[PDB]
Design an enzyme around this catalytic site. Structure first.
Site, PDB file in Angstrom:
ATOM      1  CG  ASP A  67      -1.797  -1.227   1.257  1.00 58.10           C
ATOM      2  OD1 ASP A  67      -2.024  -1.843   0.198  1.00 58.10           O
ATOM      3  OD2 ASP A  67      -2.243  -1.587   2.364  1.00 58.10           O
ATOM      4  CB  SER A  68       4.047   2.172  -0.383  1.00 54.92           C
ATOM      5  OG  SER A  68       4.881   3.304  -0.490  1.00 54.92           O
TER       6      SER A  68
END
Ligand SMILES: [Zn+2]
Ligand SMILES: [Zn+2]
Ligand SMILES: [Zn+2]
Lengths: 71, 47, 76, 1117, 55, 115, 66
Positions: free
Chosen positions: D749-750
């Site tokens: 989730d980056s």
RNA sequence: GUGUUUUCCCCUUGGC
């Protein structure tokens, strides 16, 4: 004393001057003061709309014409 | 001899407001006014 | 110390031309609060030069610099 | 002619005309306008004249309200900048008539007595901005896009959140398990805008001869059996009773069901012993029987079923209404009628800024009447003719409203903890979709920390009323809710014209009924008052509907429900009923035909409007309880065409189905292609996306504002976000996203951002923080003043550099400032103590503008705001419209990012693993259609349910521009230039940058400030606090067996301290270590002392024990 | 006194490309030039002086 | 705020060496060249030029951390050939390549004109 | 707010095309033919002009003086 | 040569 010889309504706050003229018209039950207020307000409205268009006169006019023809 | 110039919020007129003074524009009497920009060196990188 | 709180220009090294205020300084290094970036660097004090921010004259009342064409009475 | 499909164009000429007529916050403006125009006058009008030795009568008339004025007209921006309360004086005409001995009364009318300032909601019918043009609003430094609908209280924009409640005047039958009652017929009653709050009734049945029906009248401690209550209404006979409760005796089942309640009451027949019974159950029972009767007589006259009527209506009209409460209880017990669902939204009402304020004005008024009463008493009753103009403590209204709108404590300050809380929240100026959604926000009062799921669940009845997607994922999840785009909250209208109309049309009034008629006759319920019955309900429904479609007798907001199965017509006109417009269907054609569309397309040019669609019987406001009885097609071409018929009996048609979405949810493109929690997460994050939050932001001194440099219009939009005005105040940038794993710094989730794009201004934003400080006369010798401190005189003085600010004592715009720099130099005289204000620690910005003014007190007041350019960095939280969220994990320059055949490097690379578990396929379709839009050269449509759009159609278009039809591309590795073997999905997607920047979150401590009471680190970053090593961490270190690191964390690195304790007792000794002498008073020992390394909080605990008379005698033995 | 704050102006000026087709190979990097301020051997000075004295 | 200044990617600090050979111990005739303030631009062309050397048994380059501006180039040659001279010739000939390419490009420019 | 000087993604100067873009739209070029006529080929440059919202024209409605 | 200080409760909002 300063406001005596120097007119205010042409200031940038012309909307406030129109609100004040509306208040003076509404406060008065005399028809003469109401008609003088109506005349002053119409004159100030015309002047301010002219100045708004003059500042709107270039580039602002162009993007208004493009949005209105685009829709 | 710097009188602390302020800018009227309505008139945009400059106002001299020394100490112990009420904030009013001497043009309008309007009660809001803003300090003028600094005189120091404002330098940016354009980074 | 003698050079704290003054506006300084970094005259040498990688930060050449950056303007900042000396928040602190030893004899070896200032700490310079950089005007542009959100950062305070430590910089060898010989790299700095004082710029200052002052105004001359100090006499606003009557610097007429003559004048602005004084109108005559018998001209009208 | 009819719309021959091609209907999408027509469908959004409607809607467009709606939002022209009714801008998004209409539900706030109308509520307030109705409060000021009617409810205020209603409250002062219906307050009784005040009277008392002679006695006056004092009476009020024709309440007047001016424009808002400072004492001259205050503009709202002035009230905002000067921290004033934007308000208008309220004046009333008061007639005083004192009369005394000798018959000498003088009715002297005190004209236009000033009662107080009432705060005005912005852009209302009484705001200075009303109808004011965009030119003038800009001249006022106002934003023409700003919606209005909020108050200014001491400079803070305060919104009144619409508070949900159970509908008044409406019977509801509930089963409350875990109680003695099998069923409970609740009612909550209000006759009209009463200063008395709603009175609640219950007619419960004991579950356990069995089956006894009770009643829980108000102001009664016990529970009178109902038959006693009907006898107290004067019905002696068991057949006059039951005629109210069993409308046909031909039903044996209800008869034999009610019998055991009569067997509970047959000891009582006359009304007088019945009243003695009720009076003896009074909460304040009178000693003499007669006072008990009079008390109980009043309760029935005035406190039970007040909506049905009072005084003469008691002994009949509300006897019938109580009979109906019993009847519906019996139906719920026989199971002939299902229980009412407490969370069905037709059973709820919304207290908007009108009723919310009317409640206070009934509370602050009447208080004023008490005040003037006590005053005139003190005076007049001493034969001292009072003046009322001194009696009127105008402070009561002006400060009562100011206070409640400020704190939000909806009640007296004397009793605020007993009141509702957070009714009035600071308007969320963070981003324009947040402002718009905060104004359209509803709130259930149901307790959070209430574990119940059912009030948090998305009920079927929120369709089209409330956004199914926009809810806080926190503890408020499902309690706080949001209006849907076309949802309109009904403002309320008088039923009297409807009652007069129903007196026509052969309606039969309730008091003229022969009760045998009720058996086979529909019962009519105006605002939940049963008012009559009718023989023919197929004519009423068609006529009442026709009249709504003609706007004449019945205003559009009125809702007539026809319950077929039970013969009941219920008509609601009251306020707070959420409704939404629907196209009317007749036969199977719509009434909305090509005439209306053509007329409405030339609108303004012909001054047609949405109001003409309403007043042409073409569209109709339906409300959730009438929605029970509509048959609702969803589009004409889908549902009314001659397929093998589903029903063919549609009464109404959805205008467009995307109008079920609210403000932040309808910015999501393709939300019908996303997993629903992800649409919720976007509805959340969309309230945090930095943008331009309002165009006059240069005048705002908001405490926190984030302004994006180059916010862009989305390359794919819903049509709905036209009306949200998102393309004017957008919040985000269309960025060439690539969904590739690449270097792995985007993994969980980056996102990998392009450093060179950031260098060009990609998502670069500015952060404005405004610091406000004013002056004061602290006391005789104590006074604050803006002044450069000087070490010579200013005694207290921080280690800071005070010379950055000039001799005014104010930092000047354009000066670089950093944490603990001095911003407003301030001294308070003792010589002078330093009292100045410093920039928040590690803030580091530039002074943007400095304003100086006078507050209400006429003290110099200045607000300084400091800007801070926030170039995106690693850890800044980005998100997209599809609930994909992630911190920038690294930034690669353009040379290092992968590149297509042309040198298009992504701007944002997000890891593929974000997609498959989350199924945000709306994100992929956005990227694909954005790539089409950017090549095609116009903005794609992502309106959800638009079957004109599909992935295959987009792929077909995309293939025409010479790209892979699925959006994949061959990328080349930026490091080596080799083609990446997997082709990468890359294309424009609208990203947001959220307020959650990392430099606002990074925090560290190493022996900073300490609390005063327990000498532990302070709490929080702003305080330079220390992180809590909590309980659970204690447990995790016990599990580690890390006792040395547990001792250091829970002691030596927190509150290291020492005590001396006596060896003989364990009370802490006295220890003058300064002279190395020690004693315990109580043993008089000086050698028997030992030092104890001791947590300060432990020392403090033991001293808090000793102060309870507990000796925790610590022993070394 | 434009509606854009100084960092925004400065940023935009940064991105304006300059016709350094030749002079870039002449000039030193300022970090490497031995002079206390900017000089024409390590920089090019620019001025902008504009006021909107018309509608 | 605790951001590296952008010049840190290419400017050496006082005392940083550009290049710093280190004899590898695991196998004979292997070194690790640690270039400071360089990246895949200078490290990948050297790596791929070393693979054209037949006397180079191993050649590769890595960037230990992208937030750090430092590459490691490990070269192993045959015992008759130190990787010091492998790396030297890999630069000498790669300069000869780029210079020939520059001359050929310069002529090709003025040959596209009127040609 | 104002037009970005460079296309964020690639680098092409787009800050001298906005008034031209709008003038071509006022010649009633279709919205992608305006971009084809300015010379924006890559969709990364095209989304600079298509997406740009020119809010500075609204900010200039507010008066400092006159 | 003089130098680190300095508020609280309550409510609301938001982050994982
Ligand atoms: Zn002892
Ligand atoms: Zn030089
Ligand atoms: Zn580009």
């Amino acid at each position: 004393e300063k406001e005596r010889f120097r007119k205010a309504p042409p200031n940038y706050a012309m909307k406030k001057t129109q609100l004040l003229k509306e208040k003076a018209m509404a406060e008065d039950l005399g028809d003469q003061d109401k008609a003088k207020q109506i005349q002053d307000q119409l004159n100030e409205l015309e002047e301010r709309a002219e100045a708004l268009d003059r500042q709107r006169t270039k580039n602002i006019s162009a993007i208004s014409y493009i949005n209105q023809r685009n829709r | 001899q710097q009188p602390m110039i302020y800018i009227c919020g309505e008139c945009h007129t400059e106002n001299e407001i020394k100490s112990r003074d009420p904030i009013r524009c001497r043009e309008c009497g309007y009660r809001i006014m803003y300090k003028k920009r600094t005189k120091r060196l404002v330098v940016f990188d354009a980074r | 110390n003698e050079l704290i709180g003054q506006t300084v220009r970094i005259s040498q090294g990688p930060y050449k031309g950056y303007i900042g205020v000396v928040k602190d300084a030893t004899e070896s290094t200032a700490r310079v609060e950089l005007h542009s970036t959100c950062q305070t660097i430590s910089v060898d004090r010989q790299r700095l030069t004082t710029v200052g921010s002052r105004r001359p004259g100090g006499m606003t009342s009557t610097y007429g610099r003559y004048g602005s064409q004084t109108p005559m009475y018998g001209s009208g | 002619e009819i719309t021959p499909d091609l209907w999408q164009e027509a469908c959004w000429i409607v809607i467009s005309s709606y939002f022209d007529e009714k801008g998004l916050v209409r539900q706030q403006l109308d509520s307030f306008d109705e409060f000021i125009q009617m409810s205020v006058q209603r409250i002062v009008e219906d307050a009784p004249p005040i009277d008392l030795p002679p006695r006056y009568l004092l009476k009020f008339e024709q309440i007047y309200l001016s424009k808002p004025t400072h004492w001259s007209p205050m503009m709202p921006n002035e009230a905002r900048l000067r921290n004033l309360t934007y308000s208008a004086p309220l004046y009333v005409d008061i007639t005083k008539t004192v009369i005394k001995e000798g018959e000498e009364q003088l009715q002297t009318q005190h004209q236009k007595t000033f009662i107080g300032k009432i705060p005005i909601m912005l852009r209302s019918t009484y705001c200075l901005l009303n109808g004011l043009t965009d030119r003038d609003l800009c001249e006022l430094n106002e934003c023409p896009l700003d919606p209005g609908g909020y108050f200014i209280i001491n400079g803070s924009e305060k919104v009144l959140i619409a508070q949900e409640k159970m509908a008044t005047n409406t019977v509801y039958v509930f089963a409350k398990k875990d109680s003695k009652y099998a069923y409970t017929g609740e009612c909550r009653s209000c006759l009209e805008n009463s200063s008395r709050p709603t009175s609640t009734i219950w007619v419960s049945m004991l579950a356990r001869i069995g089956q006894r029906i009770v009643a829980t009248l108000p102001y009664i401690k016990q529970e009178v059996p109902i038959i006693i209550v009907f006898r107290a209404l004067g019905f002696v006979s068991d057949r006059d009773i039951l005629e109210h409760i069993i409308y046909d005796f031909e039903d044996p089942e209800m008869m034999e069901m009610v019998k055991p309640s009569l067997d509970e009451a047959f000891v009582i027949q006359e009304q007088n012993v019945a009243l003695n019974f009720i009076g003896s159950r009074g909460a304040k029972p009178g000693v003499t029987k007669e006072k008990r009767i009079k008390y109980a007589k009043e309760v029935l006259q005035k406190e039970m079923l007040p909506h049905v009527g009072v005084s003469d209506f008691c002994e009949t009209k509300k006897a019938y209404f109580l009979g109906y409460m019993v009847h519906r209880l019996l139906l719920a017990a026989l199971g002939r009628r299902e229980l009412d669902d407490r969370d069905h939204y037709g059973n709820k009402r919304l207290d908007l800024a009108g009723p919310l304020l009317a409640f206070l004005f009934r509370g602050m008024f009447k208080n004023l009447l008490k005040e003037v009463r006590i005053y005139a008493q003190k005076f007049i009753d001493r034969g001292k003719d009072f003046n009322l103009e001194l009696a009127i403590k105008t402070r009561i209204i002006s400060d009562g409203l100011k206070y409640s709108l400020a704190t939000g404590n909806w009640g007296d300050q004397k009793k605020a903890h007993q009141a509702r809380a957070g009714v009035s929240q600071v308007l969320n100026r963070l981003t324009f979709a947040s402002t718009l959604s905060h104004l359209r926000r509803l709130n259930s009062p149901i307790g959070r920390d209430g574990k119940l799921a059912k009030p948090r669940q998305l009920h079927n009845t929120l369709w089209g009323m409330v956004c199914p997607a926009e809810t806080p994922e926190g503890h408020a999840v499902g309690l706080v809710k949001n209006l849907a785009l076309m949802a309109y909250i009904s403002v309320g209208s008088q039923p009297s014209p409807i009652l007069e109309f129903l007196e026509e049309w052969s309606m039969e009034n309730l008091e003229e009924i022969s009760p045998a008629a009720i058996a086979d006759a529909t019962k009519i319920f105006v605002n939940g008052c049963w008012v009559g019955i009718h023989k023919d309900p197929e004519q009423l429904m068609n006529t009442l509907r026709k009249l709504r479609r003609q706007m004449d007798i019945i205003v559009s907001e009125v809702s007539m429900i026809r319950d077929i199965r039970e013969r009941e017509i219920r008509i609601y006109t009251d306020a707070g009923r959420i409704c939404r417009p629907l196209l009317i269907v007749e036969k199977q054609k719509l009434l909305l035909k090509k005439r209306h569309i053509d007329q409405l397309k030339e609108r303004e040019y012909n001054n047609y409007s949405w109001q003409d669609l309403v007043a042409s019987g073409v569209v109709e406001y339906i409300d959730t309880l009438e929605e029970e009885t509509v048959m609702l097609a969803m589009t004409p071409d889908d549902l009314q065409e001659k397929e093998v018929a589903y029903c063919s009996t549609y009464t109404h048609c959805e205008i467009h189905p995307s109008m079920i979405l609210g403000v932040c949810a309808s910015i999501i493109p393709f939300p019908d292609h996303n997993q629903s929690p992800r649409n919720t997460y976007q509805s959340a994050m969309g309230k945090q996306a930095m943008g331009v939050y309002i165009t006059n932001f240069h005048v705002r001194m908001d405490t926190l504002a984030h302004v994006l440099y180059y916010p862009q219009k989305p390359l794919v939009t819903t049509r709905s976000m036209e009306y949200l005005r998102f393309r004017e105040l957008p919040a985000g940038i269309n960025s060439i996203v690539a969904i590739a794993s690449y270097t792995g710094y985007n993994q969980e989730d980056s996102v990998i951002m392009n450093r060179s794009a950031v260098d060009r201004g990609f998502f670069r934003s500015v952060f404005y923080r405004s610091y406000k400080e004013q002056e004061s006369k602290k006391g005789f010798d104590q006074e604050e003043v803006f002044e450069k401190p000087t070490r010579e005189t200013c005694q207290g003085m921080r280690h800071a550099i005070y010379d950055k600010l000039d001799d005014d004592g104010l930092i000047a715009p354009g000066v670089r400032v950093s944490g603990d720099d001095v911003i407003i130099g301030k001294t308070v005289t003792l010589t002078k103590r330093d009292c100045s204000t410093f920039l928040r620690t590690s803030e580091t910005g530039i002074v943007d503008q400095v304003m100086v003014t006078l507050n209400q007190e006429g003290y110099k007041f200045c607000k300084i705001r400091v800007r801070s350019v926030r170039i995106p960095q690693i850890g800044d939280k980005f998100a997209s419209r599809h609930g994909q969220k992630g911190t920038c994990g690294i930034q690669y320059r353009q040379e290092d990012m992968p590149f297509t055949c042309e040198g298009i490097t992504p701007d944002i690379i997000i890891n593929p693993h974000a997609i498959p578990s989350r199924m945000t396929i709306g994100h992929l379709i956005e990227c694909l259609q954005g790539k089409v839009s950017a090549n095609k050269g116009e903005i794609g449509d992502a309106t959800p349910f638009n079957d004109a759009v599909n992935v295959q159609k987009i792929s077909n278009l995309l293939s025409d521009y010479g790209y892979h039809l699925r959006g994949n591309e061959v990328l080349y590795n930026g490091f080596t230039g080799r083609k990446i073997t997997s082709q990468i999905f890359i294309g424009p997607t609208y990203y947001q940058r959220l307020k959650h920047m990392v430099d606002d979150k990074i925090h560290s401590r190493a022996r900073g400030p300490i609390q005063i009471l327990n000498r532990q680190p302070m709490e929080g970053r702003s305080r330079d606090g220390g992180l809590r090593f909590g309980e659970m961490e204690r447990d995790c270190q016990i599990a580690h067996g890390a006792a040395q690191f547990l001792r250091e964390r829970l002691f030596e690195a927190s509150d290291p301290y020492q005590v001396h304790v006596c060896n003989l007792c364990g009370i802490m000794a006295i220890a003058n270590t300064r002279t190395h002498t020690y004693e315990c008073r109580g043993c008089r020992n000086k050698t028997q002392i030992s030092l104890v390394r001791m947590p300060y909080a432990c020392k403090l605990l033991f001293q808090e024990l000793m102060s309870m008379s507990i000796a925790p005698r610590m022993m070394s033995v | 006194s434009s509606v854009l704050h100084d960092e925004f102006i400065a940023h935009r000026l940064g991105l304006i490309p300059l016709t350094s087709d030749d002079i870039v190979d002449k000039l030193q990097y300022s970090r490497d030039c031995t002079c206390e301020e900017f000089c024409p051997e390590c920089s090019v000075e620019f001025t902008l002086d504009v006021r909107c004295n018309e509608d | 705020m605790n951001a590296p200044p952008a010049f840190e990617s290419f400017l050496l600090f006082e005392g940083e060496k550009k290049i710093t050979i280190n004899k590898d111990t695991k196998v004979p005739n292997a070194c690790l060249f640690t270039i400071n303030k360089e990246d895949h631009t200078l490290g990948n062309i050297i790596k791929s030029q070393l693979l054209k050397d037949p006397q180079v048994l191993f050649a590769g380059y890595k960037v230990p951390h992208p937030l750090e501006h430092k590459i490691i180039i490990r070269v192993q040659t045959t015992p008759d050939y130190s990787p010091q001279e492998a790396f030297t010739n890999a630069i000498t000939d790669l300069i000869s390549e780029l210079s020939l390419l520059e001359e050929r490009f310069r002529v090709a420019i003025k040959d596209k004109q009127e040609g | 707010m104002i037009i970005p000087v460079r296309c964020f993604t690639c680098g092409k100067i787009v800050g001298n095309k906005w008034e031209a873009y709008l003038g071509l739209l006022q010649a009633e070029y279709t919205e992608g033919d305006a971009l084809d006529a300015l010379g924006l080929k890559r969709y990364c440059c095209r989304r600079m002009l298509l997406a740009h919202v020119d809010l500075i024209e609204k900010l200039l409605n507010y008066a400092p003086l006159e």
